[PDB]
Design an enzyme around this catalytic site. Structure first.
Site, short mmCIF file in Angstrom:
data_model
loop_
_atom_site.label_atom_id
_atom_site.label_comp_id
_atom_site.label_asym_id
_atom_site.label_seq_id
_atom_site.Cartn_x
_atom_site.Cartn_y
_atom_site.Cartn_z
N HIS A 162 28.96 31.85 41.12
CA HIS A 162 29.75 32.99 41.65
C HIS A 162 30.46 33.82 40.56
CE1 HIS A 162 33.25 30.20 41.75
NE2 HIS A 162 33.85 31.29 41.29
N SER A 180 37.75 29.00 38.05
CA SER A 180 36.39 28.67 38.51
C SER A 180 35.37 28.63 37.40
CB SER A 180 35.94 29.57 39.66
OG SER A 180 35.69 30.87 39.18
N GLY A 181 34.41 27.72 37.55
CA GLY A 181 33.38 27.55 36.53
C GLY A 181 33.74 26.45 35.55
N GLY A 224 40.69 32.37 38.26
CA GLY A 224 40.41 32.34 36.82
C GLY A 224 40.03 30.97 36.32
N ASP A 238 26.70 26.22 43.94
CA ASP A 238 27.49 27.07 43.05
C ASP A 238 27.42 26.52 41.64
OD1 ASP A 238 29.11 29.14 42.21
OD2 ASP A 238 30.93 28.37 43.13
C1 LIG Z 1 42.90 39.61 32.16
O1 LIG Z 1 41.82 38.79 32.67
C2 LIG Z 1 41.87 38.50 33.99
O2 LIG Z 1 42.80 38.77 34.71
N1 LIG Z 1 40.72 37.87 34.36
C3 LIG Z 1 40.46 37.24 35.61
C4 LIG Z 1 41.42 36.97 36.58
C5 LIG Z 1 41.05 36.41 37.79
C6 LIG Z 1 39.71 36.11 38.07
C7 LIG Z 1 38.74 36.40 37.08
C8 LIG Z 1 39.12 36.96 35.87
N2 LIG Z 1 37.36 36.16 37.33
C9 LIG Z 1 36.63 36.85 38.23
O3 LIG Z 1 37.12 37.62 39.04
C10 LIG Z 1 35.14 36.59 38.17
C11 LIG Z 1 34.55 36.21 39.52
C12 LIG Z 1 35.10 34.90 40.09
C13 LIG Z 1 35.67 35.04 41.52
C14 LIG Z 1 36.37 33.78 42.11
C15 LIG Z 1 37.37 33.11 41.17
N3 LIG Z 1 38.02 31.95 41.78
C16 LIG Z 1 38.59 31.01 40.99
O4 LIG Z 1 38.75 31.20 39.78
C17 LIG Z 1 39.09 29.80 41.68
C18 LIG Z 1 39.18 29.57 42.99
C19 LIG Z 1 39.73 28.36 43.62
C20 LIG Z 1 39.13 27.13 43.30
C21 LIG Z 1 39.65 25.96 43.83
CL1 LIG Z 1 38.89 24.43 43.42
C22 LIG Z 1 40.74 25.96 44.67
C23 LIG Z 1 41.34 27.17 44.99
C24 LIG Z 1 40.84 28.37 44.49
N4 LIG Z 1 41.42 29.61 44.91
C25 LIG Z 1 41.57 30.15 46.13
N5 LIG Z 1 42.09 31.34 46.02
N6 LIG Z 1 42.26 31.54 44.68
N7 LIG Z 1 41.86 30.51 44.01
C26 LIG Z 1 38.37 34.10 40.66
N8 LIG Z 1 38.53 34.41 39.38
C27 LIG Z 1 39.39 35.49 39.37
C28 LIG Z 1 39.75 35.80 40.65
N9 LIG Z 1 39.10 34.91 41.45
#
Ligand SMILES: COC(=O)Nc1ccc2c(c1)NC(=O)CCCCC[C@H](NC(=O)/C=C/c1cc(Cl)ccc1-n1cnnn1)c1nc-2c[nH]1
Length: 238
Positions: A44, A188-189, A186, A93
């Site tokens: 994802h 995830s992965g 942030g 995933d």
């Molecule tokens: C300045 O840099 C930044 O701000 N970078 C920056 C900032 C934010 C993000 C990204 C970059 N990455 C992405 O959006 C890529 C696409 C990725 C989508 C999804 C990703 N999800 C997670 O990371 C984890 C979720 C998660 C996992 C578990 Cl086990 C439990 C609860 C969880 N959550 C439920 N709701 N929130 N968390 C995510 N990542 C962000 C938002 N969402």
């Protein structure tokens, strides 16, 4: 990471920070070094990523402030997403990044062992989730890599917590019934690393949850042991 603490440098040397340069450079996702040209991460993470050319893998990082224009990184030659992947909530995933160059192993960057298919029966009691993700739903990427120890949850208990979802055995859940510690935006992965017989194993890949660290909402991770043959298919191709 919610309810975690600062990691010490070299504590999670398989942990990487995957950055995108489009439109500007920022942290995208976590990942784990599993081979000298291989990063295991979540499928994802590549939503809307049209090319591996915009990706930069940084290893040996404790603090995001270590990353500037002059900081070395690994380019990505190829993004390999599982064929059955549709969305995080439906499983599969998982993705591999084939790096353009080889990682030189050392005390700051080295691989995490994949779980053994024979250890599908072992009960892991020392599991940790790491990342530079948010400390709560409305937050920001953290400078210092965080860690949180979290107990694994059975598939049956996780299914009870996610009414309306299908929690398969290709997923593994982790969280406290009362909440308080979890992955968040942030993270995830990144890895869910479990220590067994003095060896760290890549048990899960941070995938999804309903909110972050909520009571009775465990984090859902890709159950890496169920994908060992898929990883070997992609990394050991003749
Ligand atoms: C300045 O840099 C930044 O701000 N970078 C920056 C900032 C934010 C993000 C990204 C970059 N990455 C992405 O959006 C890529 C696409 C990725 C989508 C999804 C990703 N999800 C997670 O990371 C984890 C979720 C998660 C996992 C578990 Cl086990 C439990 C609860 C969880 N959550 C439920 N709701 N929130 N968390 C995510 N990542 C962000 C938002 N969402």
């Amino acid at each position: 990471i919610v309810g975690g603490t600062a990691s010490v440098r070299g504590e999670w040397p398989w942990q990487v920070t995957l950055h995108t340069t489009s439109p500007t450079q920022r942290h995208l996702c976590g990942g784990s070094i599993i081979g000298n040209q291989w990063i295991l991460t979540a499928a994802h993470c590549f939503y809307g990523v049209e090319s591996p050319k915009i990706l930069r893998v940084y290893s040996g990082i404790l603090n995001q402030s270590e990353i500037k224009e002059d900081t070395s990184f690994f380019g990505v030659q190829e993004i390999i997403i599982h064929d059955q992947y549709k969305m995080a909530e439906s499983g599969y995933d998982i993705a591999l990044l084939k790096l353009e160059t080889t990682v030189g192993y050392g005390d700051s960057q080295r691989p995490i062992c994949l779980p053994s298919k024979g250890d599908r029966n072992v009960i892991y009691t020392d599991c940790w989730v790491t990342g530079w993700g948010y400390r709560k739903l409305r937050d920001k990427i953290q400078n210092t890599l965080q860690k949180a120890k979290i107990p694994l949850v059975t598939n049956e208990e996780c299914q009870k917590r996610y009414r309306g979802h299908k929690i398969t055995h290709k997923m593994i859940c982790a969280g406290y019934r009362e909440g308080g510690k979890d992955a968040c935006k942030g993270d995830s992965g990144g890895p869910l690393s479990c220590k067994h017989n003095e060896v760290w194993h890549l048990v899960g890949i941070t995938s999804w949850g309903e909110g972050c660290a909520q009571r009775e909402r465990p984090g859902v991770y890709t159950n890496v042991v169920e994908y060992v043959d898929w990883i070997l298919e992609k990394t050991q191709a003749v």
